[PDB]
């Protein structure tokens, strides 16, 4: 048992974190006050769920989680929500004045006022660990805190925890549910400064999640609540292997081994099925073949892109529920013949498979029907570079006119950082092009 610390930065990271830990508690049988009747070792243990929860002498199971924001509105809701007693109160950390959708404020001027406290509080959690393996960092690309403070924190964590893995869950901007015109800037700036410091990053395209809510869950105008419960379902499917017994992705290092062939191309595409409206409680159950085929349908992807015009470097299937291994193998065999799924010539072409036989969990207030079996496919495809191309294009349109740049230069950033970041993104798009061959 080696511990993992989850860090949630900015509004998006905090609100998604709240949804994730609610679901985690449900999956492990933990109550909102931290009690876990099924855990018969009171005040301690080394079970798989202890990677994410510590224990107090009173039987309280406490998330290994830190929440950070530069204004208090969102974290104040955690302090008073259903799970107000779950977290370490000192691991909920807020400033007074936010980054105003300005990367430079989050990274330089405002972020610098709280970074040392955040690191000292993370150190307190790390000191609790017998064998810390690393960090899971949740944040938006588009916010000034999610972009700028996350980059600052990742830089500092690399210095203070040199051998620890750092994984990201990053919210990629969609104008349908955003009011930040400068998000393309913040997105490129944080990607440039974080690339060296992140070992694996799962982008979540808000437009993809929006589409799924509208099309599969029949929600006309998705709220952040709708988006976050779906995102939390997918995050849980990705982190389950760290929290339960299993054979695939059993620690943070293995995520990199399985999904990241070399360090800069570290952005796997997640695809999740099935997503069924809770109104359809009596849906006929889908087969292993059906949910597996669904993983290669663009409609179920977490990021909008077309893997049919890219190359695969890695493919892992993480099943949950009533899934017989022989049926997975036959479905995979069918996938290769029916579909055109092209791998690069230097990687093994086999699909790695994990099965967690516990039925998937849904939150009662959620929009999802219970299902007997579900699957999250994690692939590293060059097609995800289309997501970078879209961001880089919006960046270029605005930067050609230097629109909004004065806000950043007035908050501790040199103007040269814009072109430095954009050149790094150009090199990243070239990295994908060269791997695509």
């Amino acid at each position: 048992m080696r511990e993992c610390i989850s860090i949630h930065v900015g509004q998006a990271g905090v609100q998604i974190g709240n949804a994730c830990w609610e679901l985690y508690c449900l999956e492990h049988g933990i109550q909102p006050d931290g009690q876990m009747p099924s855990d018969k070792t009171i005040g301690g243990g080394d079970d798989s769920f202890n990677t994410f929860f510590s224990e107090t002498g009173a039987g309280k199971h406490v998330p290994r989680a830190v929440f950070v924001d530069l204004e208090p509105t969102v974290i104040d809701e955690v302090r008073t929500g259903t799970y107000r007693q779950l977290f370490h109160p000192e691991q909920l950390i807020t400033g007074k004045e936010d980054a105003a959708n300005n990367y430079a404020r989050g990274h330089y001027t405002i972020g610098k006022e709280i970074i040392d406290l955040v690191l000292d509080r993370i150190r307190k959690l790390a000191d609790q660990c017998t064998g810390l393996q690393g960090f899971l960092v949740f944040h938006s690309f588009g916010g000034g805190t999610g972009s700028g403070f996350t980059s600052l924190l990742m830089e500092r964590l690399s210095v203070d925890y040199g051998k620890k893995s750092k994984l990201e869950f990053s919210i990629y901007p969609a104008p349908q549910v955003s009011t930040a015109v400068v998000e393309p800037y913040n997105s490129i700036l944080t990607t440039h400064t974080t690339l060296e410091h992140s070992d694996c990053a799962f982008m979540v395209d808000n437009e993809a999640i929006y589409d799924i809510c509208r099309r599969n869950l029949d929600i006309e105008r998705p709220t952040y609540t709708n988006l976050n419960r779906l995102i939390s379902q997918i995050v849980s499917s990705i982190t389950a292997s760290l929290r339960f017994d299993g054979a695939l992705n059993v620690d943070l290092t293995e995520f990199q081994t399985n999904l990241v062939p070399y360090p800069r191309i570290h952005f796997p595409l997640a695809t999740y099925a099935p997503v069924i409206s809770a109104e359809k409680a009596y849906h006929e159950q889908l087969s292993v073949a059906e949910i597996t085929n669904a993983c290669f349908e663009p409609a179920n992807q977490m990021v909008k892109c077309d893997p049919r015009h890219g190359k695969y470097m890695a493919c892992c299937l993480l099943y949950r529920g009533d899934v017989v291994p022989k049926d997975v193998n036959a479905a995979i065999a069918t996938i290769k013949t029916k579909r055109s799924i092209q791998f690069v010539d230097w990687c093994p072409t086999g699909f790695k498979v994990g099965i967690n036989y516990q039925p998937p969990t849904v939150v009662p207030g959620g929009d999802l029907a219970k299902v007997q079996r579900a699957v999250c496919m994690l692939s590293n495809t060059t097609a995800i570079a289309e997501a970078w191309a879209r961001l880089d294009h919006k960046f270029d349109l605005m930067y050609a006119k230097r629109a909004f740049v004065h806000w950043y230069v007035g908050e501790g950033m040199e103007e040269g950082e814009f072109s430095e970041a954009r050149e790094d993104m150009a090199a990243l798009e070239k990295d994908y092009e060269e791997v695509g061959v």
Partner: protein, 425 residues
């Protein structure tokens, strides 16, 4: 950040400022004695943005009242909510400014400004996390224009890290006491270009045209004009007083509205335009973008939108709002610059204003605002070429080159707007 500090300067500034406090006090359930007798808990959730809480559940506007003329402070105090303001926050002289920017900026105004700053400092010191400042004033007089811009410069120096927004009333011969108003406004605009983050251009030319031509008021009064102004100011501050779910202070809104620091002069609009049935969402959207609804006398179809914000208030289909906002950008895509992607943003507040179930407030950052500045510049130049009444300003120490400088800065601003109106991606 939460608190805003409000300053109102001069006759116009205090008149529209008083109406602002009447209107938002009613919206928040605050009576003229500062007592809260509202009905909804949402009325108090963000009350601290504009009100200090005193003893006995008493709310006091965070407002400073300034004038070189004593009479104006008397008229505000006798107004409906006159007794609601902090008596020590009245800072007035006795001489007046005589519609002379120079007197407001260099003479009588300079002698009074430090007293105003002392009150500002006292209000700022008691804020948990000050967002910044809002100032109401006219540009055509002497106190609001000359002393108002002096106050802005002094505040910018002392609070460089705080947002400074103005509601600035632009002069028009249609509502005019004197031909020196173009002087006073031109001298003021250079100050606003350098020292404010956002300026709402409240154009008396547009206000008059709305009342006379749209509302059919044969003889518009200041009260008629100010009815439009208070509706606009209520709508522009709604996102800070009833934030609902948006998480945005003044700075975050300025970041997303102002792509170039000097080009921060906004065209406000409001629907429905009324004088003292409910519209549909399509009607709200159509009227908001209509030139006749603009509170600045500029034709938006003569320029391009850099950014647009729109605040809908009332019970309405969020989806329908999205469809209508989409339709406007699609049918008229050429009037929104293509090099600022997704540059039109909207919010919906469930709580409607007084007397209306459906309303919308428009905030346009359009290059067409150059038409307003060209109008003032042409009048300024007509007067300045004949050197008319310059000795009223040179007599207060001003130099003729200061007029030349103001003319040049004005036309540089116009040139800057034209540059981005013709730009392409």
């Amino acid at each position: 950040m939460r608190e805003i500090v409000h300053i109102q300067a001069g006759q116009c500034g205090n008149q529209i400022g008083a109406k602002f406090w009447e209107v938002i006090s009613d919206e928040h359930g605050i009576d003229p004695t500062g007592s809260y007798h509202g009905d909804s808990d949402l009325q108090l959730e963000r009350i601290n943005v504009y009100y200090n809480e005193a003893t006995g559940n008493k709310y006091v506007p965070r407002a400073i009242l300034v004038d070189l003329e004593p009479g104006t402070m008397d008229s505000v105090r006798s107004g409906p909510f006159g007794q609601i303001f902090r008596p020590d926050n009245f800072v007035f002289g006795q001489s007046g400014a005589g519609n002379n920017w120079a007197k407001g900026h260099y003479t009588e105004g300079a002698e009074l400004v430090d007293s105003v700053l002392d009150v500002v400092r006292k209000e700022s010191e008691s804020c948990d996390c000050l967002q910044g400042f809002q100032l109401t004033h006219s540009l055509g007089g002497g106190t609001g224009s000359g002393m108002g811009t002096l106050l802005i410069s002094k505040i910018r120096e002392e609070y460089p890290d705080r947002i400074m927004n103005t509601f600035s009333v632009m002069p028009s011969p249609k509502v005019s006491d004197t031909v020196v108003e173009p002087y006073n406004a031109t001298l003021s605009v250079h100050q606003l270009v350098e020292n404010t983050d956002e300026t709402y251009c409240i154009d008396n030319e547009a206000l008059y045209d709305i009342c006379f031509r749209t509302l059919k008021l044969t003889t518009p009064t200041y009260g008629d004009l100010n009815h439009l102004v208070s509706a606009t100011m209520s709508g522009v501050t709604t996102c800070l007083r009833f934030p609902g779910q948006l998480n945005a202070d003044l700075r975050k809104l300025a970041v997303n509205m102002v792509p170039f620091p000097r080009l921060h002069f906004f065209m406000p609009g409001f629907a429905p335009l009324t004088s003292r049935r409910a519209l549909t969402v399509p009607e709200l959207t159509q009227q908001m973008f209509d030139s006749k609804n603009m509170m600045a006398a500029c034709d938006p179809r003569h320029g391009r939108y850099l950014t647009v914000a729109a605040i809908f208030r009332g019970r309405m289909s969020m989806k329908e709002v999205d469809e209508q906002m989409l339709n406007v950008q699609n049918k008229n895509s050429s009037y929104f610059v293509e090099w600022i992607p997704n540059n039109v943003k909207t919010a919906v507040c469930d709580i409607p204003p007084r007397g209306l179930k459906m309303s919308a407030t428009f905030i346009g950052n359009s290059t067409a605002i150059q038409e307003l500045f060209k109008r003032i510049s042409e009048q300024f130049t007509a007067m300045f070429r004949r050197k008319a009444f310059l000795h009223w300003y040179t007599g207060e120490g001003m130099d003729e080159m200061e007029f030349t400088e103001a003319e040049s800065n004005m036309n540089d601003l116009v040139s800057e707007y034209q540059q981005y109106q013709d730009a392409t991606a």
